[PDB]
From a paper:
To enhance the signal of itraconazole in the density map, we synthesized Br-labeled itraconazole (I-Br) which contains four cis-stereoisomers. The structure was then determined at 4.0-Å resolution from ~210 k particles. The isomers are indistinguishable at this resolution and they have similar interactions with the binding pocket; therefore, we built a model using the Br-labeled cis-2R,4 S,2′S isomer as a representative of the Br-labeled itraconazole mixture. Superimposing the cryo-EM structure of I-Br-bound NPC1 to the crystal structure of NPC1-ΔNTD reveals subtle differences between the TMs and no noticeable conformation changes between lumenal domains. Our structural analysis reveals that P691 is located at the exit of the putative transport tunnel. Itraconazole may prevent this transport through blocking the tunnel directly.
Two lysosomal proteins, NPC1 and NPC2, collaborate to export cholesterol from the lysosomal membrane. Human NPC1 has 1278 amino-acid residues, including an N-terminal lumenal domain (NTD), a middle lumenal domain (MLD), a C-terminal lumenal domain (CTD), and 13 TMs. Then, NPC1 employs its NTD and MLD to bind NPC2 and transfer its cholesterol.
Numbering used by the authors: 24 to 287, 334 to 641, 650 to 796, 814 to 1255
C-alpha cells in the first residue's frame, strides 16, 4: 500500500504539493510507459499498477535536471540516487519506510472539493545505502575544474560535507529544487514497526549492464592499475674497444718479431690500332664528332628532371604500395598550413573564480588584449585571393569542409574557433559592474575539457563546438603547456588544412598559387604585440630550389682551376696548352653524350647526379691523359723508327694497364645497379656509361690528335726526365729500406684498428633541419616546433576490405570498452598511448565503432525512423508520427547483430550535429568508412586517426616507424585472420620519406660488397693468372672504405642515400690508384722484388700523383668560398677524405705490402 498520490496546489510558483491517499495502487496510463521505462526501469515488470501518474514523473525529471547536468559522467552514481527518487515517487512499499507527521488541508478554486496537502513526513532510509552512495560518488570530478562535483551540490566545501548532511541538504528546500523538507531517519534496522529502505546498490567500480561501461578511473580511482612502465633499456658498452685496443697489441707483436728476426697477348692488338690512328688522323676524328653529336642530340627531346619530394622510394616498394591505397579508397592526405603565434611582451595573468576560490594562472598569449589582434590576423588571412589561369581563387574553393553541402564554413583549428571566430561573443560579461559571474576565462576553461559538447552548463549558452561542425582539440591548438592541464598555455597554433587529390593535376598548383600569396602576406607583416613563425607544406620544397641556386659561381671557378692546371702540368716556352683545352672538350662532351643517351631512353635526371658525375668523369678521364703523355715524354726516340711506330709502341705499353682501370669500375657499377634505392639506382647507370663512353673516346679521339701536337712541336712555332724523376728517385728508396718498413705498416694497420672500433657508432639518418639557409624562416620554425607542440603528424590505422562487422566477433576485433575483449584494436592503441616515450604514439584512438553504438543506443533520443517509408527523421524536427530506431527492449539494448547494423549505418554517416543529440557521424566520420552497394550492402576500409608525439630528429621518425609496424603486426596476428587477405598497416605523411632508412644497413652490405666482389672478379679476367695479385687489390680497396666509414664518425657525417652515392664513389675512384701500380708491378723484368717496386713507382706512380693535385686544389677552392651548408657537409669532406685517404693507402702503403708478399713469374 502507498501513502500519497497526484499533485495538490502551489507552494510557490511552479513547486506543488502531493495529495493524501492511503489505499490501493493505481494502474498507470499507457502513454506514461515511455517515461517510467526511462526513469524507473526496476518497476516496469509483470503487473504495471504502481502509485504514480505521468505528471509526477514529468515534473520530477525537470526537478533533477541539474544532477543530470553534473552527474552524467558516471551513470552508476546517478543510477543510485535514481533508485532513491523512484522509491520516493511510487514504490508499493511506501507504507514500510514512510511516516507522515504533518498534514494540511487544501481548497480548490476549480472543482471546489476540499483536498489534503502533504506537509511533512519522515523518510526511513538505509545508512549503508548512503555509505555506498558516498563511497561510490565521493571522487566525481566537476566539469571545468579539478574539484569535486559534490562541492557545487553540497552548498559548502566538498571535503567536509558527509553523506548524511549532504542528503539533508538535498532534501532541504533552501537550495531551490525541492518544494518542501523531507525529514530523514538514517538507520539500518526495523525501528518500531517500520522497514527502512535497503534496496540493492552497485558501486561505481561495478556496472549495472553490459552497455554501461565501468566508470573509468578519472572519477573513481579505487581500482585501476597504475601507469605501467615496460621500457626495459638494453645493455650497451659491452664490445667498446675491447677488440680494438687489444687486437692491435697482437699487431704490435707479429710486426715486432721482424725487429728481432735480424738476430741470425695484348700489345699486338693496341699497337696495330695506334698505327692506323696515326697513319690517317683525318677520318677517325670525323667518326668521333658525328657519333657524339648523333648520340648527344637526344637530350633536347626529353631533358626531364624530377623534383617532387617523393623521389626516394621505388614505385613497387612497400611504402608506396601502402600509400597508393589512398588514390581510390578514401582520398588523399590533407596538407597543413601551420602558423605559430606567441607574445613575449605580455606578462602572466591570474584568474579568481566567483562562487568558490580556486585561482588559475593564464599564460601570456591568450589574454583578450592579444586575442583581438590574433582574431584580426585570423580574419585577415581568409580575405586573401590569388589568380590561376586569370581567374580569382579564394580559400573556400581549396580548403576542405568536413560536411560540405550543408554549410561551407572553412575549417580553422584556432583557439578562437572555441569562440566561433567573432568579436561580440568574446565580451559576454555576465553580472553587474560590481562583480562578474562568468566571462571568456571560465568558458575557455570549460571548452577544453569537452570540445564536442555544444550547450555549456555555465550562465552562458555559447556552443563550444567549432564553426565547421568538428570538435577543435586542445592538442593541435596550444603549445608549451605542462603535459596535462592547458591553462599554462604559452603558444597558439593556427592550422589551415587543404586538399591534394593526386589523380588530378590541374588543381594542385591552383592551391600553391594561394600558398605563395599566404607566404607573401605573412612575410610582409609588422606587429609590435606578438612574434610569429609560419610554414606552408610547399615551403619545405621551395627552400631547396632557393638554396640550390647559390653555388653556381663558387664551382664554375672551381672547374676553371682544373681547366688551367692541365695547361701548366704538361711539359717541363713550348708547353702543351691546346691539347689540355682539347682534353676538356673530350670529357665535357662525353658526359653530355652519356646524359643525352639515357635522356632519349627516358630515365629522369636527378639533382644528385648532375654535380657528382662531372667530378668523377673528370677525375678518372684526366688520369688517362697524365699517365699517357708523360709516359710518351719519358720515352726517347729510337734510331730507325718514326713517330707512328713510337706511338704504337708506347700505346701498346701503357693502354693495357689503362684498359683494366676503365673496364673494372665500369662493369663494377653496372653490376651495382641492382639496388632499389632510386638515388643510387639512377646514379650508377650514368656513372658507368659516362666513363665507358669516355674511355672509348680517348682511345679514338685523343690519341689520333697527339700526332698533330708532335707535328706542331716539330715545326717549333706556336699556335727531358727532369720534372719529378729527380724527386721520385730520391723519395722512393727510403720507403723500401729496412729502417721505415715496419713503421708505415704499423701506423696504417693501427688506423684500420681505429676505424674498425667506431663502426658501432656509425651515425644513421639525415637531419631534416640541416638542409636550409640560415637566414630563412624555416630554421626558426624547426627551432619552434621542437620547443612548443606536443602532437606532431597524424597516423591512420587502415583495415582493408574482408572483415565481417556483423557477427559478434566481427565487432569484438575492433570493439572498445562497454564490457568487451581486452585484445581488440582500439584497446591496443589505447594501451600504447600511455607509453609514449616507449612507442611514439601520443593520444587516444577516437574511433567511430564506439560512437556509432552511442548514436544507435535506445536511450539516445537521436535517430527517428519514419513509420511508413523508413526515411530518417531529423533529431531537431518536431517528430509528429515517426518512431524509434531500436525498439526499447532488454534484448534490443545490445549492439546489433544482423544486417540492421549496416541498415542503420548510412543514416549515422548522413547526420549533422544537432543540439538535442550528440555530434553525429557526418561531422568527422563522413570520409572514415567506405560504403559499397551490391549483395545488399557492404562496408569498406576503416581508419582510426591518432596523433604521434612531437618529433624533432632523424632517430625519432624511424623509431616511430618500427614500433608503429610492431603494433600493426602485433594486432594482425592476434586478430586471427585467414591468410593475408587484409592487414592493419599504418599510414602517415612521412612513411615514404623514412622507409629506406629502416633498411639502409642491409642493402649497403649488399651493394658495396657486390661492387667490391666485381673488383675481385674482373681483375682475374684482365690479369689472367696471379690470384695473389688480385687479392692484394681487393684488400686495399676494402681497407680504404672502412677508413671512409672511420671519417664519417670523425667529422660526424650521416649515412643517408645522399652520402651513399658518394660512398660507392670511393669503390669506383680508389681502383684508379690501385690498378696502375699493380699492372706495373706484375710485369717488370727484375729478379728481386724490392728494386722491382721502385720501377713501378718511378714509371707510373709519379704520373698518378700528378693526377691527384687537380682534385686536391679543386678541394680548397670549395671551402675558400663555401656558401651553402648541405654542399659543405657531404660533398666537400667526402672528396677531401677520399683523395687524401685513397692516395695515401694507394701509392705509399701498397708498395710496402708489395715488398712483403710480392708475387713473381
Ligand atoms: C620531412 C622529410 C622531408 C620531406 N625531407 N627529408 C629529406 N628531404 C630532402 C630532399 C632532397 C634533398 N636534396 C638532396 C641533394 N641536394 C643537393 C645538395 C648539393 C648539391 O650540389 C649543388 C649543385 C647542384 O646543382 C648546382 C646548381 N645548379 C645549376 N643548375 C642546376 N642546379 C650545380 C653546381 C655545380 C655544377 Cl658543375 C653543376 C650544378 Cl647543376 O649546384 C646538389 C644537390 C639537394 C637537396 C635533401 Br638534402 C633532403 C626532404 O625534403
Ligand atoms: C600550471 O597550472 C597549475 C594549475 O593548478 C598552476 O597551479 C596553481 O598555481 C597558482 C599560483 O600558485 C595558483 O592558482 C594555485 O596555487 C595556490 O594554491 C594554494 C592552495 O592553498 C593557495 O593558498 C595559494 O593562493 C596558491 O597561489 C595553483 N593551483 C593548484 C590547483 O594547485 C601552476 O602553478 C601552473 N604552472 C606554473 C609554472 O605556473
Ligand atoms: C558558420 O555558419 C553559421 C551558420 O550556419 C554562421 O552563423 C551566423 O553567421 C552570420 C553571418 O553569415 C552571423 O550573423 C553570425 O556569425 C551567425 N548568426 C548569428 C545570429 O549569430 C557562422 O557565423 C559561420 N562561421 C563563420 C566563422 O563564419
Ligand atoms: C578584404 O575585405 C574588405 C571588406 O570586405 C575589402 O574591401 C577588400 O577588398 C578585401 N581584400 C581583398 C584582398 O580582396
Ligand atoms: C585577365 O582578366 C582580366 C579581368 O578579369 C581581363 O580584363 C583581361 O582581359 C584578362 N586577360 C587575358 C589575357 O585573358
Ligand atoms: C542550454 O541549456 C539551458 C538549460 O536551461 C537552456 O536554458 C538553454 O536554452 C540551452 N541552450 C540552447 C542553445 O538550447
Ligand atoms: C598591441 O598593439 C596595438 C597597436 O595598435 C596597441 O593598441 C596595443 O596597446 C598593444 N597591446 C598591448 C598589450 O600593449
Ligand atoms: C584478458 O582478460 C582475461 C580474463 O580476465 C585474461 O585471462 C587475459 O590475461 C587478459 N588479457 C591480457 C592480455 O592480459
Ligand atoms: C615522457 O615524455 C614526456 C614528453 O611529453 C616527458 O614530459 C616525460 O618526462 C617523459 N617520461 C619520463 C618518465 O621521463
Ligand atoms: C533537420 O531536418 C530538416 C528537415 O526538413 C531540415 O530542414 C534541416 O536542415 C535539418 N537540420 C540539419 C542541421 O541538418
Ligand atoms: C504508425 O503506423 C501504424 C501502422 O502503419 C499505425 O497503427 C500507427 O498509428 C502509426 N503511428 C503514428 C504515430 O501515427
Amino acid at each position: 500500500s502507498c501513502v500519497w498520490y497526484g499533485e495538490c496546489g502551489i507552494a510557490y510558483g511552479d513547486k506543488r504539493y502531493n495529495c493524501e491517499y492511503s489505499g490501493p495502487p493505481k494502474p498507470l496510463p499507457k502513454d506514461g510507459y515511455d517515461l517510467v521505462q526511462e526513469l524507473c526501469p526496476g518497476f516496469f515488470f509483470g503487473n504495471v499498477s504502481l502509485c504514480c501518474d505521468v505528471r509526477q514523473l514529468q515534473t520530477l525529471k525537470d526537478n533533477l535536471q541539474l544532477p543530470l547536468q553534473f552527474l552524467s559522467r558516471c551513470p552508476s552514481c546517478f543510477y543510485n540516487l535514481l533508485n532513491l527518487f523512484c522509491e520516493l515517487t511510487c514504490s508499493p512499499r511506501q507504507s514500510q519506510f514512510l511516516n507522515v507527521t504533518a498534514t494540511e488541508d487544501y481548497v480548490d478554486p476549480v472543482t471546489n472539493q476540499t483536498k489534503t496537502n502533504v506537509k511533512e513526513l519522515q523518510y526511513y532510509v538505509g545508512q549503508s545505502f548512503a555509505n555506498a552512495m558516498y563511497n561510490a560518488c565521493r571522487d566525481v570530478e566537476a566539469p571545468s575544474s579539478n574539484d569535486k562535483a559534490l562541492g557545487l551540490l553540497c552548498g559548502k566545501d566538498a571535503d567536509a560535507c558527509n553523506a548524511t548532511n549532504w542528503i539533508e541538504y538535498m532534501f532541504n528546500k533552501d537550495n531551490g529544487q525541492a518544494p518542501f523538507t523531507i525529514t530523514p531517519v538514517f538507520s539500518d534496522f526495523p525501528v518500531h514497526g517500520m522497514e527502512p529502505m535497503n534496496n540493492a546498490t552497485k558501486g561505481c567500480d561495478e556496472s549495472v549492464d553490459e552497455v554501461t561501461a565501468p566508470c573509468s578511473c578519472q572519477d573513481c580511482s579505487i581500482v585501476c592499475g597504475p601507469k605501467p612502465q615496460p621500457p626495459p633499456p638494453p645493455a650497451p658498452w659491452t664490445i667498446l674497444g675491447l677488440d680494438a685496443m687489444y687486437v692491435i697489441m697482437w699487431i704490435t707483436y707479429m710486426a715486432f718479431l721482424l725487429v728481432f728476426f735480424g738476430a741470425f697477348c695484348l700489345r699486338r692488338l693496341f699497337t696495330r690500332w695506334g698505327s692506323f690512328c696515326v697513319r690517317n688522323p683525318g677520318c677517325v676524328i670525323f667518326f668521333s664528332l658525328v657519333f657524339i653529336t648523333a648520340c648527344s642530340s637526344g637530350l633536347v627531346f626529353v631533358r626531364v628532371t624530377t623534383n617532387p619530394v617523393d623521389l626516394w622510394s621505388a614505385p613497387s616498394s612497400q611504402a608506396r604500395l601502402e600509400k597508393e591505397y589512398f588514390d581510390q579508397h578514401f582520398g588523399p592526405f590533407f596538407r597543413t598550413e601551420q602558423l605559430i603565434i606567441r607574445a613575449p611582451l605580455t606578462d602572466k595573468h591570474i584568474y579568481q573564480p566567483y562562487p568558490s576560490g580556486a585561482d588559475v594562472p593564464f599564460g601570456p598569449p591568450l589574454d583578450i588584449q592579444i586575442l583581438h589582434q590574433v582574431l584580426d590576423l585570423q580574419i585577415a588571412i581568409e580575405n586573401i585571393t590569388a589568380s590561376y589561369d586569370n581567374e580569382t581563387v579564394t580559400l573556400q574553393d581549396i580548403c576542405l569542409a568536413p560536411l560540405s553541402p550543408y554549410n561551407t564554413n572553412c575549417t580553422i583549428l584556432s583557439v578562437l574557433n572555441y569562440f566561433q571566430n567573432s568579436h561580440s561573443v568574446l565580451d559576454h560579461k555576465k553580472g553587474d559592474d560590481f562583480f562578474v559571474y562568468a566571462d571568456y576565462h571560465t568558458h575557455f576553461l570549460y571548452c577544453v575539457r569537452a570540445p564536442a559538447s555544444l550547450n555549456d552548463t555555465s550562465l552562458l549558452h555559447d556552443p563550444c563546438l567549432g564553426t565547421f561542425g568538428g570538435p577543435v582539440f586542445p592538442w593541435l591548438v596550444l603549445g608549451g603547456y605542462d603535459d596535462q592541464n592547458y591553462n599554462n598555455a604559452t603558444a597558439l597554433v593556427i592550422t589551415f588544412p587543404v586538399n591534394n587529390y593526386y589523380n588530378d593535376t590541374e588543381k594542385l598548383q591552383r592551391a600553391q598559387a594561394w600558398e605563395k600569396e599566404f607566404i607573401n602576406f605573412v612575410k610582409n607583416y609588422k606587429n609590435p604585440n606578438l612574434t610569429i613563425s609560419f610554414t606552408a607544406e610547399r615551403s619545405i620544397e621551395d627552400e631547396l630550389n632557393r638554396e640550390s641556386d647559390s653555388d653556381v659561381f663558387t664551382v664554375v671557378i672551381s672547374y676553371a682551376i682544373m681547366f688551367l692546371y692541365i695547361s701548366l702540368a704538361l711539359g717541363h716556352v713550348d708547353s702543351k696548352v691546346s691539347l689540355g683545352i682539347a682534353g676538356i672538350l673530350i670529357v665535357l662532351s662525353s658526359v653530355a653524350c652519356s646524359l643525352g643517351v639515357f635522356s632519349y631512353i627516358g630515365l629522369p635526371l636527378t639533382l644528385i647526379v648532375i654535380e657528382v658525375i662531372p667530378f668523377l668523369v673528370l677525375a678518372v678521364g684526366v688520369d688517362n691523359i697524365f699517365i699517357l703523355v708523360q709516359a710518351y715524354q719519358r720515352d726517347e726516340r729510337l734510331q730507325g723508327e718514326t713517330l707512328d711506330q713510337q706511338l704504337g709502341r708506347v700505346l701498346g705499353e701503357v693502354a693495357p694497364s689503362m684498359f683494366l682501370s676503365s673496364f673494372s669500375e665500369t662493369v663494377a657499377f653496372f653490376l651495382g645497379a641492382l639496388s632499389v634505392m632510386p638515388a643510387v639506382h639512377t646514379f650508377s647507370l650514368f656513372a658507368g656509361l659516362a666513363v665507358f663512353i669516355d674511355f672509348l673516346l680517348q682511345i679514338t679521339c685523343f690519341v689520333s690528335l697527339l700526332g698533330l701536337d708532335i707535328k706542331r712541336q716539330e715545326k717549333n712555332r706556336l699556335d727531358e726526365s727532369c720534372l719529378f724523376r729527380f724527386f721520385k728517385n730520391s723519395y722512393s728508396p727510403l720507403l723500401l729500406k729496412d729502417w721505415m718498413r715496419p713503421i708505415v705498416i704499423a701506423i696504417f694497420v693501427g688506423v684500420l684498428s681505429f676505424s674498425i672500433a667506431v663502426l658501432n657508432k656509425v651515425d644513421i639518418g639525415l637531419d631534416q633541419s640541416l638542409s636550409m639557409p640560415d637566414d630563412s624562416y624555416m630554421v626558426d620554425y624547426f627551432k619552434s616546433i621542437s620547443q612548443y607542440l606536443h602532437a606532431g603528424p597524424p597516423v591512420y590505422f587502415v583495415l582493408e576490405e574482408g572483415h565481417d562487422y556483423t557477427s559478434s566477433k566481427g565487432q569484438n576485433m575492433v570493439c572498445g570498452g562497454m564490457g568487451c575483449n581486452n585484445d581488440s584494436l582500439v584497446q591496443q592503441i589505447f594501451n600504447a598511448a600511455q607509453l609514449d616515450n616507449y612507442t611514439r604514439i601520443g593520444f587516444a584512438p577516437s574511433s567511430w565503432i564506439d560512437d556509432y553504438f552511442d548514436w544507435v543506443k535506445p536511450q539516445s533520443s537521436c535517430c527517428r525512423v519514419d513509420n511508413i517509408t523508413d526515411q530518417f527523421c531529423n533529431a531537431s524536427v518536431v517528430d509528429p508520427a515517426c518512431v524509434r530506431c531500436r525498439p526499447l527492449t532488454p534484448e534490443g539494448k545490445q549492439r546489433p547483430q544482423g544486417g540492421d547494423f549496416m541498415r542503420f549505418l548510412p543514416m549515422f554517416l548522413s547526420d549533422n550535429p544537432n543540439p538535442k543529440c550528440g555530434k553525429g557521424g557526418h561531422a568527422a566520420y563522413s570520409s572514415a568508412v567506405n560504403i559499397l552497394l551490391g549483395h545488399g550492402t557492404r562496408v569498406g576500409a576503416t581508419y582510426f586517426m591518432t596523433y604521434h608525439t612531437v618529433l624533432q630528429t632523424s632517430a625519432d621518425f624511424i623509431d616511430a616507424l618500427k614500433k608503429a609496424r610492431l603494433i600493426a603486426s602485433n594486432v594482425t596476428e592476434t586478430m586471427g585472420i585467414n591468410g593475408s587477405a587484409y592487414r592493419v598497416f599504418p599510414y602517415s605523411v612521412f612513411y615514404v620519406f623514412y622507409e629506406q632508412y629502416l633498411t639502409i644497413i642491409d642493402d649497403t652490405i649488399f651493394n658495396l660488397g657486390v661492387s667490391l666482389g666485381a673488383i675481385f672478379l674482373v681483375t682475374m679476367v684482365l690479369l689472367g693468372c696471379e690470384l695473389w695479385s688480385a687479392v692484394i687489390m681487393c684488400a686495399t680497396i676494402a681497407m680504404v672504405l672502412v677508413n671512409m666509414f672511420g671519417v664519417m664518425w670523425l667529422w660526424g657525417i650521416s649515412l643517408n642515400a645522399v652520402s651513399l652515392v658518394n660512398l660507392v664513389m670511393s669503390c669506383g675512384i680508389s681502383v684508379e690508384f690501385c690498378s696502375h701500380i699493380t699492372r706495373a708491378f706484375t710485369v717488370s723484368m727484375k729478379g728481386s722484388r724490392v728494386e722491382r717496386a721502385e720501377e713501378a713507382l718511378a714509371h707510373m706512380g709519379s704520373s698518378v700523383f700528378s693526377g691527384i693535385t687537380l682534385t686536391k686544389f679543386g678541394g680548397i677552392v670549395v671551402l675558400a668560398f663555401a656558401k651553402s651548408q648541405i654542399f659543405q657537409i657531404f660533398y666537400f669532406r667526402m672528396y677531401l677524405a677520399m683523395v687524401l685517404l685513397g692516395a695515401t693507402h694507394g701509392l705509399i702503403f701498397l708498395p710496402v705490402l708489395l715488398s712483403y708478399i710480392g708475387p713473381s713469374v
